[PDB]
Structure formats: structure tokens, C-alpha cells
Amino acid sequence: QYSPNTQQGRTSIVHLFEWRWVDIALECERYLAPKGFGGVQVSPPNENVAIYNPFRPWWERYQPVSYKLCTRSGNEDEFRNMVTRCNNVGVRIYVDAVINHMCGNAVSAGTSSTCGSYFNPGSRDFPAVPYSGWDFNDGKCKTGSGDIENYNDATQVRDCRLTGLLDLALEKDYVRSKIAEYMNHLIDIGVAGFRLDASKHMWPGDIKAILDKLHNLNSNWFPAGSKPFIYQEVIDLGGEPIKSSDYFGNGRVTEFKYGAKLGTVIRKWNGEKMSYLKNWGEGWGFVPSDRALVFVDNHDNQRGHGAGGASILTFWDARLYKMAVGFMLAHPYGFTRVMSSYRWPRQFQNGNDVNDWVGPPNNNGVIKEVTINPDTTCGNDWVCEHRWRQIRNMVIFRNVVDGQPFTNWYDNGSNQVAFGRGNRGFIVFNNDDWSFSLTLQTGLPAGTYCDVISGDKINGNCTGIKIYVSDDGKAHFSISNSAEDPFIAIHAESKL
């Protein structure tokens, strides 16, 4: 469950948050395959509540109605078409599996659902699954409200309703089997793995029992006996009884400390400084690298109220965000996920964004196509961070340097740092309020290298900065604090 099942030499996943299946299929073919991306995390592909107050929020997709593959992203045939097309170009699909819960207990009964299935939260009736009252934790939860009230009680965190979401009775073989039926439908379609949503709200052993029911990956595309990649969304920032290590026997875990701390460092909050990153990884209290799914931001915490709060860097913070993403993609810790977002009219009142619910770009609730501009950016309010030169080129950097050790660290005791990845890549950052001009040991073979942040290697030339590595492995780097991107990255495949 720990291996991503990407092609060898492809080392990241991208979250194409709220994208439609047909757009992901096209993106696999036209961009993700040629640019070296390992795979795509898709939004939940199962039927959810259609919520109209407020209007079609992103978070309606975390309120299941059934396991029909029928959502605003598309129907089952469209989902299968995407998985097939992506697998056929060697780009994997990972499903966001919403399996802890059904919808909010106070949602009105009816057919306000993305496939029109009937459901009745108040009577616990989800006939399109089917689930009934026997399949929820009403009787097991011991809190006075029926909801999670106190995260210091690890039992109620698992047995009670997360902000009122009806909590499935995951100890029951019937329920485990309905979840496995859904997940095996997806595996047999060709998905390579899963994000397990709300994993802190499930017992490790119930997750294990579900995983024990799962198939190996579809043998038309994957070697025999390949296990689905599992990454469990466990928010563990310390200071609560639940530890993400309890989940290591099932798969990887999301390491939310990663982006929280990287954000604080890059923002220079509380005296933190990039020079402190020399021992980034387990030295910062993180999970073992081989159990980590890492990211700068995710779809929930990029809205400011998630794990990490205001420290999280996002596309709105583009300059610092590119630096953070670049550090992540250069550093060997973890398996990396890049975010790809949509723009919304963020409107802070009293320090909080009142429009943080807004769903994906849409016309009357129908999600807009992703259009591609001549300059390779996206239209229709899709941000497409994964197409930013500085991010895409660092996705490639990570591939190029795969397996190479962290080495040749330098820092100035403040926020000018650099390091290499064996003899295959080198990266230099200036997050101080002055220039960084110094000759550094790069570990690379002598030659001329294109900086892949300011430019590209195209037609045997560099379009941006060029770095000259001498026979001693040293090269001079100059980065003004006024530079568009105050970091430089070079690697074996950017050498002229």
C-alpha cells in the first residue's frame, strides 16, 4: 500500500481539484504525460448531495449519497474513459475515497443529489447503496450531541459525527463490504490508489479490514500482485491523542505538519528561517519519509481554516508559494503532491474568508471546461499551478534527481540556503531582504546548466539564467531579493 504505482522515474501526483473527467483525460494526454507527472488525485467520484444554500460549494462532494460514479465531474462512462486514457499514457489516477460518513444528518430528504438518487438523512435511509439506520454509529457514539465534541477523547473522534456527518458503522462486515464493493469497482476500472478521506475519524483496524477486501490493481496495466497506493488523510499536528503512526500498517499518511511548518519558515514567522531547514524531515517531528504524503497546501487548508491555519502558502501567495513548492520538490523527504486550484472571490472579513465555500468555476452549477491558453496557462479561472514553469520544471527536477542523496547543504545563518541531490541536481534559495551572490559547491559535473526556474533548456540553449559549473564542481550564483523568483535550480537534464 506504500508504493505509488507510478511509472519509474515519475515522482509526483497533482490534485486536479474539481476538474471534470473529460478535462483530466485530455490533460493526461497533452501535458501530464509529456511533462513527467506521475498521476492525478481526482475529486470524489461518487454521488454526493447537491447543496444549493450556499450554491454548489466545493464541500458538497464530501457528503456522499451513494457509490454511483455520477458527479459534477461526470458519469461512469466518462470516469472510465479518463482512467483508461490516463493509464494508456502512463499517468495514474488516485481516488478521493469518502468512506467515513454519508451526508450531514440535517440535510433535507429528497433527490437533491448529483445522480438524482433518493436519500433521507433523518431516517438514515440511503437506498442507492443501500444503507439503513443499522449501518450508522448513532448507538455507539457516547456524546450528548452525537457529534465530535472533544478531540482529547480518541473514541468519540472515531464513533461520533464529524460536524454532523452521518458516521458509518465501519466495524460491520456489511458496511466494510459496501465500501470495498465501491473501491473494487474503481480498482477494476484501473485506479492506482486512494486518498482515504477523514482517516483520523476511522479506527486503524476498520480501515485495515476494508483494505483486506481490496483487489490488486488491474492486470491489463499493472504487474500482477500490485497493491493500491493508500494515503490516509490524518490531520496530526501534535497535542492530541490520535497519532498518525497508528495508521502506518495501512498505508502512507498525509503529513500536515509539512506544509504548516514550511509555511511558517518561508513566511519567517516566529523567528523561523530557511537556514533551519538543514535537518528537514523526521528531525522536525514528521513521520518517516516512507510513510509521508507531502504537500504545501491542500484543497481544504488553502482556504485558511484547515490544518496549519494562516501559515499555509497558496497560489494567492505566488512568489513565496513557488519557493515553498520548489523546496518540497527538491528535498528527498516524502512522496510529493502538487496542488492545482481554481480562483474564487476570496473576501476576508475579520480575518476569515466569507467566500471560502465557493465551488469550482461554473455556469449555473455546471463546471466549466479547462481551457488552455497559447502561453500554456489555463483560462476559465482555473489556476493550473502545475503548469507554472517554476512548478512544472521542479516536478521534472524531482524525477531527474530521484534516488540521489541530500548533500552539499549551504546556509548563511539566515534565509539564503542551497543543497544538492547527489550529482544530479542543485538548488539555491534567497529568502532574505538582500542579495545572495556566492560561489557554491554544486556536486555536479562541469558544464553550462540552464536555470529551470527563470527559464528552460530549449533548442540547446537556455532561455533564462545560465550557471557555469567548473571542474571543481563550484558555480557562482547571484539572486537579488528583487528577482521575480528568488531561487535557481539546475539539474543533469538542464545541462547544455
Phi, psi for residue 207 in degrees, rounded to 5: -55, -50
Burial 458-467 (b: 16+ CB within 10 A, else e): eeeebebbbb
Query: What does the alpha-carbon distance between residue 3 and residue 124 come to, in Å, rounded to a whole number?
Result: 37
Q: Report what 350 binds from Cl ion, ligand NAG, Ca ion, none; CB cut-off 5-8 Å by kind.
A: none
Burial 221-250 (b: 16+ CB within 10 A, else e): bbeeebbbbbbbbbbbeeeeebebebbbeb
- Residue 233 as a binder of Cl ion (CB under 5 A): the answer is yes
Q: Which of residues 456-495 bind ligand NAG (CB under 6 A)?
A: 459-461
Figure out which of the listed residues 254, 311, 314, 431 binds Cl ion, where binding follows CB under 5 A: 254
Which residue, chain included where needed, has cell 435511509?
A: 125
Question: Any known ligand binding at 167?
Answer: yes
Residue whose C-alpha is closest to residue 274's, from 326, 336, 309 = 326
Q: Report what 461 binds from Ca ion, Cl ion, ligand NAG, none; CB cut-off 5-8 Å by kind.
A: ligand NAG
Q: How far is the CB of 459 from ligand NAG (least distance, A)?
A: 5
Which listed range, 140-148, 229-237, 245-253, 469-477, lies at the site for Cl ion (CB under 5 A)?
229-237
The smaller minimum CB distance to Cl ion, of residues 15 and 389, is found at 15
Q: How far is the CB of 346 from ligand NAG (least distance, A)?
A: 43
At residue 456's C-alpha, the angle toward residues 453 and 457, to 5°, is 140
- Residue 255 as a binder of Cl ion (CB under 5 A): the answer is no
- Residue 108 as a binder of ligand NAG (CB under 6 A): the answer is no
All residues at 6 or more sequence positions from 372 whose CB lies less than 8 Å from its CB, including other chains: 30, 378, 379
SS3 sequence, 134-179? HHECCCCCCCCCCECCCCCCHHHHHHCEHHHEEEECCCCHHHHHHH
The smaller minimum CB distance to ligand NAG, of residues 106 and 458, is found at 458
Q: Which of residues 183-202 bind Cl ion (CB under 5 A)?
A: none
Nearest-CB residue for ligand NAG: 460
Per-residue contact track with ligand NAG, 422 to 461, x per CB under 6 A?
Answer: -------------------------------------xxx
Question: Any known ligand binding at 298?
Answer: yes
Which listed range, 26-34, 232-240, 242-250, 430-438, lies at the site for Cl ion (CB under 5 A)?
232-240
Q: How far is the CB of 200 from Ca ion (least distance, A)?
A: 9
Q: How many other C-beta atoms can be found within 10 angstroms of the C-beta atom of residue 199?
A: 27
Query: What does the alpha-carbon distance between residue 128 and residue 262 come to, in Å, rounded to a whole number?
Result: 43
Which listed range, 77-85, 197-205, 434-442, 469-477, lies at the site for Ca ion (CB under 5 A)?
197-205
Q: Provide the grid cell at 267.
A: 513566511
Q: How far is the CB of 461 from ligand NAG (least distance, A)?
A: 4
Helix (H) or strand (E) holding 5: none
Q: How far is the CB of 486 from Ca ion (least distance, A)?
A: 44
- Residue 225 as a binder of ligand NAG (CB under 6 A): the answer is no
- Whether residue 304 contacts residue 296, with contact meaning beta carbons closer than 8 Å, is answered with no
Phi, psi for residue 447 in degrees, rounded to 5: 155, -170
Question: Any known ligand binding at 80?
Answer: no
Region for residue 18 given its phi and psi (left: phi exceeds 0; alpha: psi -120 to 50; beta: otherwise): left
The smaller minimum CB distance to Ca ion, of residues 56 and 201, is found at 201
- Whether residue 445 contacts residue 472, with contact meaning beta carbons closer than 8 Å, is answered with no
Q: How far is the CB of 449 from ligand NAG (least distance, A)?
A: 15
Question: Any known ligand binding at 472?
Answer: no
Q: How far is the CB of 212 from Ca ion (least distance, A)?
A: 18
- Whether residue 1 contacts residue 212, with contact meaning beta carbons closer than 8 Å, is answered with no
Query: What does the alpha-carbon distance between residue 97 and residue 183 come to, in Å, rounded to a whole number?
Result: 8
Q: Report what 460 binds from Cl ion, ligand NAG, Ca ion, none; CB cut-off 5-8 Å by kind.
A: ligand NAG
Figure out which of the listed residues 18, 47, 167, 197 binds Ca ion, where binding follows CB under 5 A: 167
Q: How far is CA 288 from CA 236, 253, 294, 325, in A?
A: 14, 10, 11, 20
Q: Which of residues 133-172 bind Cl ion (CB under 5 A)?
A: none
Catalytic residues: 197, 233
Question: Any known ligand binding at 158?
Answer: yes
Cis check for the bond before 241: say yes or no (omega within 30 of 0).
no
- Residue 201 as a binder of Ca ion (CB under 5 A): the answer is yes
Q: Report what 201 binds from ligand NAG, Cl ion, Ca ion, none; CB cut-off 5-8 Å by kind.
A: Ca ion
- Whether residue 421 contacts residue 406, with contact meaning beta carbons closer than 8 Å, is answered with yes
Q: Which of residues 282-301 bind Cl ion (CB under 5 A)?
A: 298
The footprint of ligand NAG (CB under 6 A) covers: 459-461
Site residues for Cl ion per CB under 5 A: 233, 254, 298
- Known binding residues for chloride: 195, 298, 337
Known binding-site residue numbers for Ca(2+): 100, 158, 167, 201
The residues of the shown chain that bind Ca ion, judged by CB under 5 A, are 100, 158, 167, 201
- Binding site feature residues: 100, 158, 167, 195, 201, 298, 337
